[PDB]
């Protein structure tokens, strides 16, 4: 087949060392050669991002430019409709064919709340999902009937991600970084340092555009 | 809150790749952005170090100059008294404020003998302690009554070190290095190579000052 | 004692990021300062390598040339006989002294298929997601007899232990590569650029 390509969505307001280091650390224990970052647009019934749709692309571009691992996909920024996760993967499966392995990166706490999403049953039909294990927290699913769904498709063999097109779930041990897009905004609104949390190109973009102030 | 600041003490005679690489591997999996190296002065009842207070400070300064992670604290070298751990941590909690998170880095073999250390109860009051896990050994505490003390304050979530001022104990996965300050002093008195165990600035300083010969 | 010196053997046709990335990850977890790459010549009873003895040396030499962790040993390439693993270990023990720790790196399923522990430890590259199961229930007892969880045992003793090391997963093998070259798709994520360039010069795996 072809090489496994992982997808990684998020709001990215702003992208930060958490997003990048956690995934590139994943790529070294899973053999990820490609990682496509899909920045979403937040549905209107949720707080909308501070940095607009353009700036978030600029901040991502600058942050990814010297990392060949990552490659940026702006479907959801140019999409009129609001972003639905299982819908982007239907497109990816549609465009990339049925035999290329696809993987979607989500966090542990988004696996906990996972049968919530629109069309949860269709995600594992069109891609694997890799789960960023939140250390220290238990493995507990919300409703003990799709706790069975989890160990049915759970696997500890990373070959399954490369040798099959979809259907499995891998749990990956990632480092901890005490940084989020909420942590960042607060230290800037108060004016404490941020060069340890943010790529220098992006922190400079933030200060130029006057973001989070 | 403010950045978690973690303190790391020792004699450092000389500092070597054991100290640095073990802690900078810690920093990547715990989110440590700053680590303050506190070299101690050995109480008179123990063999005193070969290299004097100045050379040990120079050797550290040379080793740490290009690593922003580590900052050096010479309280104990300029102190008249003999170095007591729970006394330095009491200074740090006082000077730094009661709301900043503090951690103290120690090895596993030093936590087994921990209620041996003076004021073992004052440490968890003012700081967290991060324990360097000696691989291949069990977690057995000396007197199975404060084995309950270990499991009372143990935590497997590195958040607690960041989001709480003090009180927890985190066990960290470290690499093994077959290098120690005793090993080095012998390999120098015997005259076999050391550029794999020691930063080249520090090994050059030692060869210039003629230490361990 | 002296430094622990690990030996790492293989065909290396071609050498690739898997061989190297996997071991340099090991070295950091075990404290390996030196790793001697011992490419083998295959005994005639299994399929022969594509690149001859020279090209497989050059490719290795280009991979290892700016990695101080690895040094290269061409015993088995210059050897008249075919290579016998415990014969290389016996020579090393002889030249090196009885006091210097030695370890031999092998993959898990190559351990699935044996007298190493006179002269050296064996560090086994754990295929992730597969169990520790030995075939014949007498050297499943040999495994846990000499199993060790303390990397000290590899650095403080000259042999006798077996260390099972967690390694990363890389979707690359020499077999994967040969086809992706004969099929004509990229390999720069699987193969060092000096080595991949060497392969296109010599027209290897095409």
């Amino acid at each position: 087949m072809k090489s496994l390509q992982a997808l990684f969505g998020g709001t990215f307001d702003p992208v930060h060392y958490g997003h990048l280091k956690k995934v590139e650390t994943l790529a070294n224990l899973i053999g990820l050669t490609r990682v496509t970052i899909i920045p979403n647009n937040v549905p209107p019934h949720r707080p909308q991002p501070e940095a607009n749709s353009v700036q978030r692309k600029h901040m991502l571009e600058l942050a990814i430019a010297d990392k060949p691992l990552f490659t940026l996909d702006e479907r959801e920024l140019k999409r009129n409709a609001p972003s639905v996760t299982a819908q982007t993967l239907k497109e990816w499966r549609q465009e990339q064919g049925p035999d290329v392995p696809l993987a979607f990166i989500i966090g542990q706490d988004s696996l906990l709340t996972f049968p919530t999403w629109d069309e949860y049953e269709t995600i594992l039909d069109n891609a694997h999902l890799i789960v960023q294990r939140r250390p220290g927290y238990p493995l507990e699913m919300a409703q003990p009937q799709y706790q069975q769904w989890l160990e049915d498709h759970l696997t500890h063999n990373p070959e399954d991600l490369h040798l099959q097109p979809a259907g499995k779930i891998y749990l990956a041990e990632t480092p901890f970084f005490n940084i989020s897009a909420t942590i960042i905004r607060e230290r800037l609104q108060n004016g404490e340092s941020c060069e340890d949390l943010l790529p220098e190109p992006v922190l400079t973009y933030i200060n130029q555009q006057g973001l989070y102030r």
Side-chain angles (χ1 to χ4, degrees), chain A:
Chain A
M1 280 154 302
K2 289 176 53 184
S3 307
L4 164 65
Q5 300 201 11
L7 313 177
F8 178 66
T11 288
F12 300 106
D13 180 22
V15 59
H16 50 76
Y17 272 162
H19 301 263
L20 301 170
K21 279 179 176 178
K22 208 179 299 302
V23 173
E24 55 192 38
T25 311
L26 204 179
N28 297 332
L29 72 142
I30 285 312
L32 287 176
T33 53
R34 183 61 66 88
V35 172
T36 298
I37 294 183
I38 307 176
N40 301 311
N41 56 346
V42 175
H45 60 60
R46 299 180 84 173
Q48 292 287 286
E50 274 280 320
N52 63 59
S53 201
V54 156
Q55 319 178 240
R56 288 189 291 123
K57 168 168 91 88
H58 289 179
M59 289 197 282
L60 268 173
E61 287 186 332
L62 299 167
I64 184 189
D66 229 9
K67 293 164 183 301
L69 171 60
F70 304 95
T71 183
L72 173 129
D73 178 8
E74 30 189 318
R75 295 175 193 272
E76 311 302 318
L77 301 184
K78 293 187 314 178
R79 168 169 290 160
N80 253 9
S83 190
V84 170
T85 295
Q87 170 57 230
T88 88
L89 289 166
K90 185 183 183 182
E91 303 181 2
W92 264 79
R93 189 93 280 167
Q94 179 73 10
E95 301 164 4
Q96 218 61 248
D99 288 337
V100 298
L102 291 175
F104 189 69
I105 317 278
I106 63 180
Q108 162 162 352
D109 49 296
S110 292
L111 181 62
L112 270 49
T113 325
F114 184 86
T116 280
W117 293 356
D118 286 320
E119 229 58 78
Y120 59 118
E121 314 157 348
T122 325
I123 294 174
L124 274 171
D125 272 325
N126 312 126
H128 307 288
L129 58 101
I130 304 169
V131 165
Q132 310 286 55
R133 193 138 165 75
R134 177 184 268 179
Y137 283 78
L139 314 83
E140 300 151 337
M141 282 303 256
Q143 226 165 20
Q145 85 253 0
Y146 32 64
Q147 166 86 4
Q148 181 74 25
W149 167 82
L150 185 67
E151 189 122 11
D152 277 351
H153 309 91
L154 199 65
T155 180
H156 306 270
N157 189 341
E159 281 186 316
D160 299 348
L161 311 177
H162 295 270
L163 290 183
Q164 310 185 4
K168 305 298 180 295
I169 291 179
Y170 182 81
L171 314 170
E173 307 287 63
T174 46
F176 182 75
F177 304 87
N178 190 22
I179 82 185
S180 79
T182 307
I183 298 308
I184 296 176
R185 292 197 230 97
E186 296 299 327
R187 317 224 324 159
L188 270 38
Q189 298 178 358
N190 291 333
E192 32 199 337
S193 164
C194 269
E195 41 264 8
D196 305 320
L197 328 180
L198 222 41
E200 179 259 293
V202 175
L203 177 57
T204 292
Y205 182 98
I206 281 172
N207 297 319
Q208 287 174 355
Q209 285 285 308
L211 278 177
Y212 317 115
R213 211 69 175 192

